[model samples]
Target: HHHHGPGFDYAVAMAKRNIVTATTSKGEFTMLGVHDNVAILPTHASPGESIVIDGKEVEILDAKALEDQAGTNLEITIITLKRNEKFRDIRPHIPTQITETNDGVLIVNTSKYPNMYVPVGAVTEQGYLNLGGRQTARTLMYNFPTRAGQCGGVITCTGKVIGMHVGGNGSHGFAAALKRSYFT
Candidate 1:
């Protein structure tokens, strides 16, 4: 944000610029803003699938599905890109927030709530309610209202990515936690 003062609004303002619309064959979804050569998402893409950004297509070099806390297979995936590409449009996003405490984290660029933090709710205390459908136990129960198709949006804390949104009712949402191991 142009102001750049010490306040929650600054993070929300900065978040607006860090969001990207990724176009797959199915449709466009929001991402944590792609750098020149890396990506992650809350959906399934076969190896070598191409996702379009900035009018260009980047192929998935590798992909791995993350399991739910209950070990159910998830639609969520982490992917690697081929090296040596360049992008002048998007900014870098370091997904270094691999762990989450019950402390609040931000969910950015979802269709309903753009650049906002959803306080981590106590539903995980019940241990993974079934909102993920097939990816059931991978759910996150934030009290904020959510939109159905914005599932691939990123969740972050203090401007760093922490997880991916998978599914949500207007009442709450499902998310898949990210980890350093998923990248390495």
Candidate 2:
């Protein structure tokens, strides 16, 4: 008997159940599945200082751990839930050579293709994006339109997650990426 390849079909299945709606005090935002009992958020997406997942309340584990560990200006937060029964089973895409040299990344929430770039003469030893501000170390940058509630959403390339939508502008969008070893 022939066997099917593991590919987009798997990604589609994961995306359908893993992508979740986060209700926060700031408003509503997107939360990508990191683990069966864990999810992440963009700092700007949780201004209300509260979060709920799958009709159940979740606890904010660390508001700045991811950013502090990466030493970046982007605000990426981590959250946890006691039970993940309602959520889908999924794993985050670990970065590799393809993610490091890809032409662009795909925004899962908007399904839009945006170009990603690192600053010229910048260091890639740590796989960080250069935003050219007080904080020069970021995961990556993308030029795309992210909706109000799409912050903290997922960004992928070739059906694999390259980064998480943190914050950005029309000219300089930033994401907390796996290629930067943020997840590791």
Candidate 3:
């Protein structure tokens, strides 16, 4: 999404930085980068404790899920067009694009296809865009690739699989939700 400035190549720069931040309903948090894992907050979650993204209530999972499931990463809920209104507490704008996958989100070219501007919504599209600015545009504080377990074979490798391609479109790198931290 065009959360950052126009022509902001987040996919290309992800290798060097965080690229996004996670915030709560009351605009309290603003976590940087994808932590070990996170749990989705309820629709009525509060600030500084719960994170509401793209309307769907999610609880970030732990890093172990990345390995335990043989590199099979659990689905991390996002604020997509389908559930845009569910996140009205945070962003009230109507999303331009919707998710095509049941457990994944679409990774559009931010530089080529910027997020549409929504001024009517209580929260500016820019606000949603900046939700994880510290992480997305900042230093590389975390890495959340799914890895294979000791028991799993090549199918469990982290580099190649459905999990890694969750939010990515083969052409660009995947965009993961940033969390403050996770439980071991």
Candidate 4:
């Protein structure tokens, strides 16, 4: 086990620390990569939405939804956190860089009951599928909870971020990989 890298135990702890909540007129969503004044979301938020980090409100300076890769149509949200009174006593964590991982630790969060759920099985399915007649390969395929899938929950494995939960069927959490160029 020493020869292997960091795994679930550490990931579980970090996942809880990194969780950030975003509230909009529509609803509340989860986000990860929370810093002193910044965070990343898996989906785009409308104007006037705000993020809550460590029980403190941090106004979003900007919220951007950039495509993952050309022709993939996958997207992720970026946040510009504004400095505020909440900066003090913030229990922030360093965000994991987007990388390739073989496992999934879905950190899905929601205030609604019967909506928060995580993966129950194993060996993630990453492949191509005919989405409505057209075949596409962009996938993170995982069993997610109804109404909670793709609510911008941070996805991790080996204590690092592979991506975030996108939209799903409550049976399959269909997530999009992060764009290489978009982050670097």
Model 4 pairs whose backbones collide: 150-166
Model 2: per-residue Cα lDDT at residue 67: 51
Q: Quote model 3's TM-score.
A: 0.20
**Which scores higher on TM-score, 2 or 3?**
2
182 in model 3: Cα distance from truth in Å?
13
Over 1-184, each residue of candidate 3 has an lDDT whose tens digit, in order, gives 6565322232223212322223444332222232223222112223332344435444433222221124322223332222211221211111222111212221221222323111111110111111112111111111223211100000101111111112212222232222222222
Could you tell me the lDDT of residue 72 within candidate 4? 45
lDDT of each: 0.54, 0.52, 0.22, 0.53
In the range 1-184, model 1's lDDT, one tens digit per residue, is 4553223453365456655556666566666534455566665433246777667887777666667556676556656556575332222334443445454444555345444555443323223555634534444455656665566666554544555676666777656665544544
Top model by lDDT, which number? 1
Q: Considering TM-score, which of the candidate structures 1 and 2 is the better prediction for this target?
A: 1
Off by over 4 Å in 4: 1-7, 34-36, 47-49, 52-57, 69-72, 84-102, 113-117, 120-137, 144-146, 179-181
Using lDDT as the measure, name the better of candidate 2 and candidate 3.
Answer: 2
CA-only RMSD, every prediction? 5.1, 6.8, 17.1, 5.7
Looking at model 3, residue 128 earns an lDDT score of 13
Error of 2 at 180 (Å): 8.8
Q: How many residue pairs collide in each prediction? A: 0, 2, 21, 1
Give the range where candidate 1 is weakest over 10 consecutive residues by summed lDDT: 86-95
Ranking by lDDT: 1, 4, 2, 3
Instruction: Give lDDT: candidate 2, residue 39.
Output: 71
Output the lDDT of residue 88, model 2. Answer: 51
lDDT (10s digit) by residue, model 2, range 32-100: 766656676775565333577557676654454455555555556666655535455344454553243
